[PDB]
Amino acid sequence: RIEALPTHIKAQVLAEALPWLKQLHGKVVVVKYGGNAMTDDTLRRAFAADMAFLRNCGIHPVVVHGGGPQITAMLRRLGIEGDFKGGFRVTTPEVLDVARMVLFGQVGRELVNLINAHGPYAVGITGEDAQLFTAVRRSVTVDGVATDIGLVGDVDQVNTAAMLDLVAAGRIPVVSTLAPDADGVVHNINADTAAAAVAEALGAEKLLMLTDIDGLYTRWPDRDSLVSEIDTGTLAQLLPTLESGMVPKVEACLRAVIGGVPSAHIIDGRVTHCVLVELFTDAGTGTKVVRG
Amino acid sequence: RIEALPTHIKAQVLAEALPWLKQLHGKVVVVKYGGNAMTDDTLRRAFAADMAFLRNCGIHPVVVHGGGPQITAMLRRLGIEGDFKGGFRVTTPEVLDVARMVLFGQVGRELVNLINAHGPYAVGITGEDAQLFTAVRRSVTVDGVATDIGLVGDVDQVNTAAMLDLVAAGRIPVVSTLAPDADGVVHNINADTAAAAVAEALGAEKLLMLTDIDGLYTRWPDRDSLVSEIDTGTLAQLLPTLESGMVPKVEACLRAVIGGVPSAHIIDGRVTHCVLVELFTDAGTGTKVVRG
Amino acid sequence: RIEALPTHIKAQVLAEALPWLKQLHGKVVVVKYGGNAMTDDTLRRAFAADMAFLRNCGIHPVVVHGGGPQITAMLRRLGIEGDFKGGFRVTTPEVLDVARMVLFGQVGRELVNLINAHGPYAVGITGEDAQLFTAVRRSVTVDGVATDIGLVGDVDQVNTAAMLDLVAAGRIPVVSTLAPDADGVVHNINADTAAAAVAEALGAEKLLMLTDIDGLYTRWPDRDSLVSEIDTGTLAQLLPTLESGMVPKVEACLRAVIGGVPSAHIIDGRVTHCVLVELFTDAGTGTKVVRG
Amino acid sequence: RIEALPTHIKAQVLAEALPWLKQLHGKVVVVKYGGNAMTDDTLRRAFAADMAFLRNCGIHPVVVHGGGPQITAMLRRLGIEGDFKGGFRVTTPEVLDVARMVLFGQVGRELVNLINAHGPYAVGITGEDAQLFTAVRRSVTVDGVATDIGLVGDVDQVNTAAMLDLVAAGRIPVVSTLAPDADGVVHNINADTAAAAVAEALGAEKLLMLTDIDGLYTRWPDRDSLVSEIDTGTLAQLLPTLESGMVPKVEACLRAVIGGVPSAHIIDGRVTHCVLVELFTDAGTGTKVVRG
Amino acid sequence: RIEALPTHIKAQVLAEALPWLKQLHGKVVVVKYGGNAMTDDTLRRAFAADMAFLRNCGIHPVVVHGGGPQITAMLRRLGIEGDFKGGFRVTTPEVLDVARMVLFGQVGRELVNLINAHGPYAVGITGEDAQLFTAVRRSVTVDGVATDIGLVGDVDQVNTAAMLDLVAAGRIPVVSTLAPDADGVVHNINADTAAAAVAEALGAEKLLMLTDIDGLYTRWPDRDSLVSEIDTGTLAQLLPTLESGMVPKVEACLRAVIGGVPSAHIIDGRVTHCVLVELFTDAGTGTKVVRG
Amino acid sequence: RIEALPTHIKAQVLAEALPWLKQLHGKVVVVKYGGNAMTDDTLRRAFAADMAFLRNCGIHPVVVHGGGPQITAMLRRLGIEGDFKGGFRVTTPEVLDVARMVLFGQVGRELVNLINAHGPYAVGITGEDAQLFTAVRRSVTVDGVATDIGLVGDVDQVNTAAMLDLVAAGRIPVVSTLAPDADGVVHNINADTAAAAVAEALGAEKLLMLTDIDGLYTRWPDRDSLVSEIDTGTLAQLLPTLESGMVPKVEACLRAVIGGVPSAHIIDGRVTHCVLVELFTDAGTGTKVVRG
Ligand SMILES: N=C(N)NOCC[C@H](N)C(=O)O
Ligand SMILES: N=C(N)NOCC[C@H](N)C(=O)O
Ligand SMILES: N=C(N)NOCC[C@H](N)C(=O)O
Ligand SMILES: N=C(N)NOCC[C@H](N)C(=O)O
Ligand SMILES: N=C(N)NOCC[C@H](N)C(=O)O
Ligand SMILES: N=C(N)NOCC[C@H](N)C(=O)O
Hints:
Largest interface: A-B, 38 and 38 residues
Strand order of the largest sheet of chain A: 5-10-2-1-13-17-18-16
Bound molecules: L-canavanine
Oligomer: homohexamer
Shape of chain A: globular
Structural class of chain A: alpha/beta
Helix content of chain A: 25-40%
Number of domains of chain A: 1
């Protein structure tokens, strides 16, 4: 029902992209890709087409993906019983091997192949490859005490130079968030915190975080709570109040934007081509976070 | 009235651009710019924004402009009485100096400045600069006899290499169609034939020719005559029948597409952002000419 | 017991490497890595140190790995019952996903990490990444009739240029042999045939094929059958007689050396640092195949 | 009468050029070109040959030209009556358009074509092209009060990098002194002040200012007043005493040499090949200004 | 007595250099340097200044030097008695060592140091260094029988690429004519034949051969015999008639010009700055040889 | 008797080279070459093969050579009687010419030719060529008074950049230690002090100094005095006690290692392939000097 669209309306949608093309040309955009945007075929195919879009505009997308539920599925099919502290599964060496094998050997593969239907762009990588980035073991807090939950950590250091060589070669890196610690022992890294760490280290112009909601509600569930733009100051003050589902997506945006990334975006991964809408439209389809 | 546009319609307009972004990324597009698209301020400002659009997509636009009516105006303000053979003004050395001074020193200037509101892109050039291209004197036919009408000719040879150096540097060349002959004497070149010559020599992916009409009508004025796509074979057979206004715009498309340019486009310069519409929409806003 | 080695013997071992350093400097060496050389920790750690050796000589190693037994293990742990035609497991879409996930997400990972203890060298890749190479479905012969056994094939075409860009950047590619067909459907490729295909396409100076035996015996099990050098002519004539374990390793050497690779080597992966011995010693530790 | 020149005299003239070739090789020389050196055909043809000379020595000439009298002529032929404050014509938007069209579209054109008889060297440019330099509106002083005289100003900022890219490509820039202000409105810039501004910004080794006199007389009209070398200190003290014709040519030399340009030269544009004489002869044909 | 030279005469000498600067810019000139031009201090210092001149014009000089008499002197001071067949000294391994040590270690050194007073330009080389060129043993004819006279030969092959790398780096190669044969045994090469061989292999624009005479006399000693220009056809026919001193200098010019070198020049090394005179003056100071 | 070497011993010798290959890959090694390592043919041929070894590992060797005894021999064959102050021969301009001619024109030549049997690597150079380094006249102390002994000095400044261009081009520089002072007058430089000066200026990873002894004895002639590793602190304190033969070799190591060179090595030039042994074996064959 878009043949029926008069040509002067198509003209104005295209033209409205100009200031965003100009702000992003030759710049890197880190895209955290997860949620339904990763399970419905229409949404995924469109997300892949959009990484190609950016690349065919001379924009440099970097995709960081998660895959928590597919790990648990494979761990269940292998009969690997988990140990849990608080709400956390302990990542034994056995669980890491499965997580790595699932993230890198299955979930990364499907994205690379989708993107590569448009051309020779996607390349899968972890922190292990060429020592592109390292991890540092992180503990969590259960009942306000810090606790070890196995081979889990945060991005420690990033080989910024070698990373930017990959995208100057015209490649879209699909990053599975696994990385060696300083002793060579590979950890699993939360894909949200990692996308923010990669955004900051690569000097990204934008960090996009796909989620399964319209945007951020300041006082959920009040419908009026929805905000389209917000700065780090007010947002950090709202943080110890939001739903548990958005605390990590917000902490990532805070860390990124304060880390120098001009804007981070919490966008609706249920919207087809949500990437194109947030980047090339003034209104967008999510919450834009800036510093202030 | 485009805030009112639902976000999923904006999504589909943007997404439909993908296969054209991919076909044009890193490619040169020669755009012949004339007609009303050059006299109404809204249209011109939009045409300038569109050259910047292409450039901010990693596309390489080259603008060839005419300016026949502004020359006649200046010739009238200078009281330079013309001599006419057939319907042709003889281009004396005096008329060339005015034509060059008007084309290069006024009409080219306004475009360069418009485009350059978006950034350091436009550079004005003639065939004289760096010997970028030469001319060869052409005669016309009045009553079926070939006749001399002064310092007028066709593009003879083009410095393809130096031309492509200019656009690899990220510059949009605004070409005033004046060029030296083999003896150094500068001629004026019809901007339509020149755009086709520059398209062919630069290996352009598309030649766009802005005119003041919807597209080509095969049996004007029959409304049903309008065609959106047509090949060189059928088109060359329609040529000794169309209106006098479109014979040059068609001959250029023939010469270009047969010269290897994959497609030439006769598009409506009265449509705002007509460049964006023909390039990034499947339907377009003109007639597409291919070989066949 | 090598402190006890007199310094003039260490001198002569080192010096004897000179003509091989000279023949290989700046050249690519494809190394097919499998067998025990991939299951005993001492052998694997030494194999990793040797890829670093080559790289620290300005030699360009490319590692192609298999992993048949680890796939069958994982298929067993997942309870995926196989279908068999002849001695062949049918590779359903389900088996491919496991094979890819095991080859790329586990077996490739361990090598990359081993090599990367020496520095930022190893990068895992499949034919899917950047469309580095494609596959073409192959059938097998059961009882002399050609038979379909699922998503299995041969290397079809190789992106030679992009491959050599990777190693000019100083990277050691660890190749998991999975590749998309012309329709995008990923197949599993026998690592032996693939190493020979990659050798030929990259213009490799040598193809090394690690196996679990001293070398090739012409009339096994006669101890006198062992040959240290042999040409394609005599070897192709010996082929329909050897043990079933060596027919693929020999066919690969034939295809490579006839494909222009100056020499292919069937070397003993049970010998620690077997790579260093075959490359930098005149005698070697395997069978050298040349054309003749 | 130069066949009659003995070969050992030709030898010594050539040899005396050596220390100046060495001081200028690979260096930029800004040449302000005006006066009779621009109206007599022998002088102009020789000036063009000399820009080619420099370029065929690996020297990088940059030509800044004026053209005040040709503007007034065209303004008279168009019947554009001027408004005058003091001795200054007000530069209305109409006068700017004529000035730009004359400077860029006629006077620049003739030089480019002359130079280009020797090869593909000359390219005409203004501050508008690629935003190569901007202007800032300047007022003048009539009777010691500062007064607005329209769209006239000084060079504000220069795109040093893009300028030096042009001459590293082997091109001789012919600069028409028109430039946009910070709002995009194009002004006309006095060619003398502009040549000094371009000299300083490009790190020029020398600024040559062609005039219609032997050199600078310190107490004109005393014949003994002529000086061949002088420093900024003494010269700035002589400035509020010289003829009105030389105050701008001197202020330019002061601004340049104090701006870091090692020497500025006021040379006689009535001398054929005056450029060659001042640059490659110890004596020169003008006044050399240094710092002190 | 050149202060007394009016400035308009200095102008015309300089200007007359233009077409030769243009023909030689970026081109290599092989200069065979010998005779008195190598023994009188004024002449040598001027010859060195002239190599710097060429280099400071973006011209690429290559100097090939001889030194026959200084070898005989050193052989006499060492008491090495010679053996002679015909008029030829047999070049024993002992004589080669002296010749190499004199040519490379003394005569080359003085030139390099002279040239390098003007800057970091000269570098001494033989065919031994980087295998820049090889030799092939040549026999001579005594009484019409070909005879061995030791380690003497002709330039066999030249590393054109590595040679042109040296001059693109901005270096003036001072070539001592010694080169290894295919077995590594170094021979001495006649500097005249070698300069012609280096001219041909480097694609030189000109070969200059300094001698101790005005130019070539066709029927010496007739004063009218002197010719300023001559082609290979007529010259080869004059060859079995000239003085013994010029047969090698002519054979070199023939071999070079027929080898594709546009012109070879036999110029008077007794004229100060003879290089500058022949290159940058229309008349020259020698005989110019062209093909015809 | 090295065929008899079991393959697993050859394996371990090769493998033990890995950490040294890694520490030296892409790094420059200055090698001072003198003593018997320069007079016995087996040792010299092996030393040449070893420079090729380094180069075929992507290591950048730079050879500094002496040749004191061959100078005295030639001075004797020429009957040039010397003048002596203390134990020092005065270097008259005559002696310099012989020294330069011997060092550069004979001793350098033989090494270049030896090395070049392995490929196009060696190039002979002095400080005179391209002004690669200068000298400063040095006086010596006879009976504790500083005394002039002619044209002798120390390396003053080094053209680090142009030097490293030579080795990035893949060339092994054979350096004859002669260099011009600031006035252009060439001096002879002690090859030991020069190797240390070149090591420091090029940022060398190691300086190797070949001598005619096992290593450094701290209290010669006590056999127990031999040390395999020692730091600058203890070594400088041992210096005013060692044999006269090693004071210069030690002072060079001190100056180098304190100059930032990570380690200097005094190795036994009587050991065949002593370079390979000290570099690629943990034990070495000399004394390693580090800072401490
Ligand atoms: N307000 C929100 N959440 N989005 O609108 C901003 C989108 C704009 N294209 C940008 O990239 O900044
Ligand atoms: N049918 C016409 N006239 N235009 O539609 C084709 C437009 C398409 N973007 C192209 O560039 O080919
Ligand atoms: N004969 C056998 N199988 N090996 O010896 C040859 C090894 C040699 N380094 C080579 O790389 O050719
Ligand atoms: N004295 C005067 N005015 N000129 O002589 C100096 C000219 C010299 N070639 C230079 O470029 O400095
Ligand atoms: N006629 C003789 N011998 N010389 O005059 C020619 C010189 C000219 N510069 C050239 O380089 O060709
Ligand atoms: N101890 C001595 N003298 N040598 O052993 C050290 C050698 C080691 N390859 C190095 O290059 O440091």
